[PDB]
Scaffold this active site. Structure first.
Site, PDB file in Angstrom:
ATOM      1  N   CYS A  84       0.790  -1.235   0.000  1.00  0.00           N
ATOM      2  CA  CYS A  84       0.000   0.000   0.000  1.00  0.00           C
ATOM      3  C   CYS A  84       0.824   1.288   0.000  1.00  0.00           C
ATOM      4  O   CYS A  84       0.269   2.372  -0.182  1.00  0.00           O
ATOM      5  CB  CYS A  84      -0.916   0.024   1.214  1.00  0.00           C
ATOM      6  SG  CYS A  84      -1.714  -1.546   1.509  1.00  0.00           S
ATOM      7  N   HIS A 122      -3.725   7.421   5.967  1.00  0.00           N
ATOM      8  CA  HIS A 122      -3.788   6.158   5.257  1.00  0.00           C
ATOM      9  C   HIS A 122      -5.195   5.584   5.430  1.00  0.00           C
ATOM     10  O   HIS A 122      -5.824   5.174   4.454  1.00  0.00           O
ATOM     11  CB  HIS A 122      -2.716   5.217   5.794  1.00  0.00           C
ATOM     12  CG  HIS A 122      -2.658   3.905   5.092  1.00  0.00           C
ATOM     13  ND1 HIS A 122      -2.531   3.801   3.724  1.00  0.00           N
ATOM     14  CD2 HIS A 122      -2.710   2.641   5.566  1.00  0.00           C
ATOM     15  CE1 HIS A 122      -2.510   2.525   3.386  1.00  0.00           C
ATOM     16  NE2 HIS A 122      -2.612   1.801   4.486  1.00  0.00           N
ATOM     17  N   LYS A 142     -10.068   7.730   1.555  1.00  0.00           N
ATOM     18  CA  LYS A 142     -10.481   6.367   1.216  1.00  0.00           C
ATOM     19  C   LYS A 142     -11.942   6.064   1.556  1.00  0.00           C
ATOM     20  O   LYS A 142     -12.521   5.131   0.999  1.00  0.00           O
ATOM     21  CB  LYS A 142      -9.574   5.332   1.887  1.00  0.00           C
ATOM     22  CG  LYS A 142      -8.175   5.282   1.304  1.00  0.00           C
ATOM     23  CD  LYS A 142      -7.409   4.081   1.820  1.00  0.00           C
ATOM     24  CE  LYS A 142      -5.979   4.042   1.274  1.00  0.00           C
ATOM     25  NZ  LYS A 142      -5.144   5.167   1.785  1.00  0.00           N
ATOM     26  N   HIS A 150      -9.630   1.794  -1.494  1.00  0.00           N
ATOM     27  CA  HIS A 150      -8.195   1.589  -1.300  1.00  0.00           C
ATOM     28  C   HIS A 150      -7.577   1.053  -2.584  1.00  0.00           C
ATOM     29  O   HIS A 150      -7.762  -0.120  -2.909  1.00  0.00           O
ATOM     30  CB  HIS A 150      -7.993   0.570  -0.168  1.00  0.00           C
ATOM     31  CG  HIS A 150      -6.579   0.448   0.308  1.00  0.00           C
ATOM     32  ND1 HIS A 150      -5.509   0.990  -0.372  1.00  0.00           N
ATOM     33  CD2 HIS A 150      -6.059  -0.172   1.393  1.00  0.00           C
ATOM     34  CE1 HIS A 150      -4.393   0.720   0.281  1.00  0.00           C
ATOM     35  NE2 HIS A 150      -4.698   0.013   1.353  1.00  0.00           N
ATOM     36  N   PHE A 185       0.944   3.285   4.554  1.00  0.00           N
ATOM     37  CA  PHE A 185       1.452   2.112   5.258  1.00  0.00           C
ATOM     38  C   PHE A 185       0.959   0.864   4.545  1.00  0.00           C
ATOM     39  O   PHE A 185      -0.217   0.794   4.186  1.00  0.00           O
ATOM     40  CB  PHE A 185       0.936   2.079   6.692  1.00  0.00           C
ATOM     41  CG  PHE A 185       1.009   3.392   7.392  1.00  0.00           C
ATOM     42  CD1 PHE A 185       2.195   4.116   7.420  1.00  0.00           C
ATOM     43  CD2 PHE A 185      -0.101   3.905   8.043  1.00  0.00           C
ATOM     44  CE1 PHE A 185       2.270   5.340   8.068  1.00  0.00           C
ATOM     45  CE2 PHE A 185      -0.032   5.121   8.698  1.00  0.00           C
ATOM     46  CZ  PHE A 185       1.155   5.841   8.711  1.00  0.00           C
ATOM     47  N   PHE A 228       1.270  -3.762   4.045  1.00  0.00           N
ATOM     48  CA  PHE A 228       1.646  -5.036   4.662  1.00  0.00           C
ATOM     49  C   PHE A 228       3.161  -5.226   4.589  1.00  0.00           C
ATOM     50  O   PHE A 228       3.829  -4.685   3.702  1.00  0.00           O
ATOM     51  CB  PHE A 228       0.967  -6.239   3.985  1.00  0.00           C
ATOM     52  CG  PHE A 228      -0.538  -6.269   4.106  1.00  0.00           C
ATOM     53  CD1 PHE A 228      -1.228  -5.446   4.992  1.00  0.00           C
ATOM     54  CD2 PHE A 228      -1.272  -7.168   3.337  1.00  0.00           C
ATOM     55  CE1 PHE A 228      -2.627  -5.502   5.079  1.00  0.00           C
ATOM     56  CE2 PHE A 228      -2.664  -7.225   3.429  1.00  0.00           C
ATOM     57  CZ  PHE A 228      -3.336  -6.391   4.302  1.00  0.00           C
TER      58      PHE A 228
HETATM   59  C1  LIG Z   1       2.564  -5.005   9.131  1.00  0.00           C
HETATM   60  C2  LIG Z   1       1.875  -3.731   8.729  1.00  0.00           C
HETATM   61  C3  LIG Z   1       0.602  -3.777   8.345  1.00  0.00           C
HETATM   62  C4  LIG Z   1      -0.156  -2.572   7.956  1.00  0.00           C
HETATM   63  C5  LIG Z   1       0.528  -1.227   7.970  1.00  0.00           C
HETATM   64  C6  LIG Z   1      -1.451  -2.779   7.638  1.00  0.00           C
HETATM   65  C7  LIG Z   1      -2.443  -1.712   7.214  1.00  0.00           C
HETATM   66  C8  LIG Z   1      -2.658  -0.648   8.296  1.00  0.00           C
HETATM   67  S1  LIG Z   1      -1.947  -0.998   5.677  1.00  0.00           S
HETATM   68  C9  LIG Z   1      -3.376  -1.422   4.941  1.00  0.00           C
HETATM   69  O1  LIG Z   1      -3.635  -1.048   3.811  1.00  0.00           O
HETATM   70  C10 LIG Z   1      -4.191  -2.180   5.668  1.00  0.00           C
HETATM   71  C11 LIG Z   1      -5.476  -2.738   5.131  1.00  0.00           C
HETATM   72  C12 LIG Z   1      -3.745  -2.398   6.900  1.00  0.00           C
HETATM   73  O2  LIG Z   1      -4.368  -3.167   7.792  1.00  0.00           O
END
Ligand SMILES: C/C=C/C(C)=C/[C@@]1(C)SC(=O)C(C)=C1O
Ligand SMILES: C/C=C/C(C)=C/[C@@]1(C)SC(=O)C(C)=C1O
Lengths: 403, 404
Positions: free
Chosen positions: A162, A297, A327, A332, A389, A391
């Site tokens: 993302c 985000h 969003k 997204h 942010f 994954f």
């Molecule tokens: C290990 C990090 C995971 C992150 C930043 C996950 C986020 C917040 S980024 C994202 O797009 C989604 C759906 C999430 O749940």
């Protein structure tokens, strides 16, 4: 050396150019619709942020044959940006000082699957055809644009789920800062398809309770949010060295005064909060104007929304800025989100307004106190921040300021 | 600007599961190419590959490996090796803002992408997909899957540029050090080996198809009867480190990265232009006050591609060209992993004073005329080496690495 944005281009769920997008943003207008394709695939989430545009014919046959949708959206966004920046072919083509950094989150799951499907059929290799590599490969977005636009400088894709297109912009800035390039086209694209979406649905990341009311599905900060709404599209910005822009009389939207890039080093699919704090602090280093608006985000997931809200608090304390999660309107777009949201924030900066964080029927109690704007508000903005942010614990923040 | 050095390395390839096995293969000219029943069974015309010969069962903890595709696995194992080879302990690299990771693949994971789609179309759908395909399948799997378990706090993203991928990763790592933003960056990449991906290159005629009965002779860079590249898999990882930081801890330094070239053809999608590579090499040689003693060519064993690079090399160097060998004749083309694996082969040649052979040249191409193509293992005292990685989409990377 200083880097500024001199042109932009966009294809999103809420508009096929910066004017259409502008309108949608000022009006709090949702780009989310019901998807028969997602339902037919056996998914639980049947809503998406689709590009409302038939792209047939808009790209030369001999060029588009190599392209997946991610590349098509980015290509079209790049055409807009070139024109918006007022760059003739002789300015940017066949030029060592002009580069391209642009990616996608997923490449093309659709064409990866098609190649495998074709190969197992009665026709084998002749059904696969000679164009799947450039469509399926993770660098398709950069490869497919660099060539027809005659790009001679840097040419590669960053990929970071993302955060993808945000890191692309940050890396473009670094190329300018290092004196290696005068111009870098930065952005990304993302296809929209069940092939990819079902993977997010299979881990419970997508919204499923609101299929009867698609426009209410994405609802960042609402107490009854149940996951993000997948979207597709593309974006591109023209990152340019300041003296170069001034010299040719370029229209400057903003300077990139801050770029944070950090890692959680914690969990794969749940954010740590720490690290986002570090990312935003990193982006604020040497920036002595206050952040007037923060494009979060804010994907409309239970855990993710408040983790970011906590990070914002820790970074800003009692001087926290106006916040909205666009969003809630757009869905997204994954790899394309960073550049699209930079563009949304650039539009707010340019036209003096804050776009509404929509669909908050009941504000989450962890969001109490904060200045989350739920209504289009006219305001003179000078400095803006945008968080990305993904994954894998990968974080990016851009800070942009009027000149 | 700060200086960047390589203080550790790790590798999983067709010709070795660590740097010691790889050193042995390079000096011997050992091929890593074998017949592949998986490829033949898929209905492909290319039946050979540069496969990793390692049972990876048990090597990565259950809760870590579950998010990983093969590219991530190979990269992860290469990174363990690199950490140890660098003399680095958790207290030094973990939870450290000034330590990052830049690593990618060319294709992500076609396998788990197709597994996801196949599973979804079965009778159990989502429940058959399961919650781990996104991290296996996403383009940034390699960076995501390593940065989390290794507790990296600095930069964390992948670069993708097809066959130049892990070479751009290294150069981007160097740039982070040059900008003063990071002290250490782990840089490299990985690539899975599977019919799901390989069939795509076969469908475009890129893969060798004539030498399936003699697998170790299918990859034959510069030979007049080459007929396309042999696909490979594996990983590589180097520790890129700021110079003063390395010396202050008494690190072992393989070499300094004194040149990084990154350019674009802006021509054709699947055929090299030549002038892009020329510019890339010239950029990498800029300010380098010593000559290039050895060049590890991109040299994939393709008719047009091999000779195009030679013509660029001739334009850059003229009469006084360096010694050249194409290690892909031994190893195969590991695509995204190729850049870091070939940076490593070049460093091993720098470190151990020799030039690996450009093998399977039964009949030199007429267009190689008057270059120094090294076809047998020869001991030499090298100082400055160069490695070229060129990818589809006209993306060019060149690294020049020199002894301190
Ligand atoms: C290990 C990090 C995971 C992150 C930043 C996950 C986020 C917040 S980024 C994202 O797009 C989604 C759906 C999430 O749940
Ligand atoms: C547009 C550029 C295409 C390039 C550099 C193609 C090369 C030479 S790079 C490569 O790996 C192969 C097999 C090729 O055919």
């Amino acid at each position: 050396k200083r880097a500024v944005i001199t042109g932009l281009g966009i294809v999103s769920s809420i508009g096929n150019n910066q004017q259409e997008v502008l309108a949608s943003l000022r009006e709090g207008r949702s780009g989310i619709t019901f998807s028969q394709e997602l339902k037919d695939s056996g998914m639980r989430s049947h809503v998406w942020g689709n590009v409302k545009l038939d792209t047939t014919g808009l790209i030369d046959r001999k060029v588009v044959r190599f392209m997946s949708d991610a590349s098509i959206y980015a290509f079209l966004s790049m055409e807009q940006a070139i024109a918006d920046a007022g760059l003739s072919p002789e300015a940017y083509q066949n030029n060592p000082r002009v580069g391209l950094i642009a990616g996608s989150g997923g490449g093309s799951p659709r064409f990866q699957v098609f190649g495998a499907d074709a190969m197992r059929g009665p026709r084998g290799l002749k059904a696969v055809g000679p164009y799947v590599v450039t469509k399926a490969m993770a660098s398709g977005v950069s490869a497919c644009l660099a060539t027809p636009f005659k790009i001679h400088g840097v040419n590669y894709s960053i990929s970071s789920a993302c955060a993808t297109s945000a890191h692309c912009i940050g890396n473009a800035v670094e190329q300018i800062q290092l004196g290696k390039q005068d111009i870098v086209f930065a952005g990304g694209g993302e296809e929209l398809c069940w092939e990819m979406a079902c993977e997010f649905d299979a881990m419970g990341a997508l919204s499923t309770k609101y299929n009867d009311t698609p426009e209410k599905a994405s609802r960042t900060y609402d107490a009854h949010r149940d996951g993000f709404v997948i979207a597709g599209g593309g974006g591109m910005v023209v990152v340019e060295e300041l003296e170069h822009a001034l010299a040719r009389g370029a229209h400057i939207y903003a300077e990139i005064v801050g770029y944070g890039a950090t890692s959680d080093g914690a969990d794969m699919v749940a954010p740590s909060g720490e690290g986002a704090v570090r990312c935003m602090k990193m982006a604020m280093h040497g920036v002595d104007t206050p952040i007037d608006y923060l494009n979060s985000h804010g994907t409309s997931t239970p855990v993710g929304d408040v983790k970011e809200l906590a990070a914002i608090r820790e970074v800003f304390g009692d001087k926290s800025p106006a916040i909205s999660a666009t969003k809630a309107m757009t869905g997204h777009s994954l790899g394309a989100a960073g550049v699209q949201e930079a563009i949304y924030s650039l539009l707010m900066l340019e036209h003096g307004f804050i776009a509404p964080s929509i669909n908050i029927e009941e504000l989450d109690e962890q969001a109490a106190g904060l200045n989350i704007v739920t209504e289009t508000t006219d305001r003179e903005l000078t400095t803006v921040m945008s968080n990305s942010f993904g994954f894998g614990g990968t974080n990016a923040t851009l800070v942009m300021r009027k000149l």
